[PDB]
Design a protein around this ligand. Structure first.
Ligand SMILES: CC1(C)CCN(Cc2ccc(N3CC(=O)NC4(CCN(c5nc(Cl)nc6[nH]ccc56)CC4)C3)cc2)CC1
Lengths: 244, 198
């Protein structure tokens, strides 16, 4: 009973999971297929989303939740729900939305439906506290338990990996989400137009367009970005060879 | 009456008013998402959960599309979802067992009213435990619920024999008859069902 063990010693039960076919070709093929990284500083509240073209195969959306600053502009779910995500999503596409562990698990589902997706996967980031068993968690008022995880919801609209990411809890006020989310996405092979909304300089990455308020440089150009997907490349999964 | 109690029945037709109020309700419904007796979405919406509690917690296991439906029932029945437990399914070596392989099961936590004297914060929202039989929930949930609300009345819906626990009244259709020891319950049962039949 690792739950009683946590009540005894302060080690979250996930601390005790151990370990937490060569799909190396996939990864290499992904990396050969990746567009150059593109990125754009944009103050998203005040930024008309439609300027972001063409329509995206995958959207990863990482809005800065107030709860992410326990001891430290936060976006409310009110703000997030008003983003016009459907206007830049492709008719068949996927969204990955980080929801935290509070009201976001509900309001995030409203967003997914609002924008036209159905949830097909709920991915959990389980945070181990192996390097600080003696650190109690200041709880949300509505909380009943100590919250030790965050959810990333996967939405689909239109016609190898587990649903768990286990890493150590980041230092207080580090809001970075595990890079593993990117591996989980890329391995799906959902297409090459990939947008990461509210990314940072630290999250820029081949095969991805990053838009966020804190980016220090931009290189984004719609016509250039579109050229990477003009024929004969429009329908690639990102998991196949380059067309010669 | 502290020791286990149970009632073989169909929650659709049982008159749950005879059971009184509980600090914690747990359910693990057979959502239509059929290898066993399934309930429809309307049948799930119509369950008379609201009479079961005035101030307390609901623990509601979900899966697949019930993750959304279960949130609907939770809200319909008058609860606010204030936590969500996941159970990480390991083996004996403590390694993890549609689009992704599912290493986990979800249990929604709902609150109703103004429950007081509970020990919020004792456990954390992750369970790591070995898989017993198919469709079995992990026993850790009962220890978590007991530390949260010790000594109080608790009811489980859609249980099976192994689910019977002290301080708990289990309702299930595959159970061994009726076994009740709380006097107030035994009374209201005889009144409502003089010849033992629903
Ligand atoms: C993985 C989990 C932790 C989370 C998800 N879930 C899924 C699941 C799997 C199986 C079942 N079921 C298997 C089974 O064989 N029986 C029931 C259904 C019939 N049942 C009734 N009980 C009452 Cl009171 N009224 C009723 N009306 C009609 C029926 C009925 C008694 C229990 C239990 C329930 C849920 C598993 C754990």
């Amino acid at each position: 009973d690792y739950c009683q063990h946590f009540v005894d010693t302060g080690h979250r039960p996930q601390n005790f999971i151990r370990d937490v076919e060569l799909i190396r070709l996939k990864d290499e093929l992904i990396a050969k297929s990746n567009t150059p990284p593109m990125y754009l500083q944009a103050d998203i509240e005040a930024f008309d989303i439609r300027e972001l073209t063409p329509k995206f195969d995958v959207i990863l959306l990482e809005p800065p939740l107030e709860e992410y600053y326990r001891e430290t502009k936060c976006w409310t779910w009110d703000d997030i729900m008003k983003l016009e995500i459907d206007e830049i999503a492709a008719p068949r596409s996927f969204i990955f939305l980080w929801c935290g562990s509070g009201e976001g698990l509900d309001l995030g589902r409203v967003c997914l439906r609002k924008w036209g997706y159905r949830r097909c996967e709920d991915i959990c980031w389980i945070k181990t506290n192996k390097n600080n068993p003696g650190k109690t968690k200041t709880l949300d008022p509505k909380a009943v338990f100590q919250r030790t995880k965050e959810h990333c919801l996967m939405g689909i609209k239109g016609t190898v990996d587990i649903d768990l990411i286990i890493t150590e809890e980041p230092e207080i006020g580090n809001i970075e989400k595990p890079v593993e989310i990117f591996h989980i996405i890329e391995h799906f092979c959902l297409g090459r137009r990939r947008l990461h909304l509210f990314g940072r300089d630290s999250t820029i990455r081949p095969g991805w367009l990053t838009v966020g308020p804190t980016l220090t440089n931009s290189n984004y150009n719609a016509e250039t970005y579109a050229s990477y997907f003009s024929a004969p490349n429009s329908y690639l999964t990102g998991c196949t060879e380059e067309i010669e | 009456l502290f020791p286990p109690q149970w009632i073989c029945c169909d929650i659709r037709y049982l008159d749950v008013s005879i059971l009184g109020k509980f600090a914690v309700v747990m359910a693990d419904p057979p959502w239509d998402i059929l290898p066993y007796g399934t309930l429809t979405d309307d049948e799930m919406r119509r369950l008379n959960i609201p009479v079961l509690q005035d101030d307390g917690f609901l623990f509601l296991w979900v899966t697949g599309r019930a993750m959304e439906l279960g949130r609907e029932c939770l809200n319909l029945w008058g609860y606010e979802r204030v936590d969500e437990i996941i159970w990480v399914k390991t083996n004996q070596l403590q390694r993890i067992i549609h689009w992704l392989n599912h290493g986990k099961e979800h249990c929604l936590v709902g609150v109703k009213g103004n429950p007081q004297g509970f020990n919020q914060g004792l456990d954390c929202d992750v369970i790591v435990a070995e898989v017993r039989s198919t469709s079995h929930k992990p026993d850790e949930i009962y220890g978590m619920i007991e530390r949260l609300s010790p000594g109080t009345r608790k009811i489980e819906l859609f249980g099976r024999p192994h689910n019977v626990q002290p301080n708990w009244i289990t309702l299930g259709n595959q159970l061994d008859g009726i076994h009740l020891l709380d006097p107030d319950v035994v009374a209201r049962f005889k009144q409502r069902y003089p010849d033992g039949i629903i």
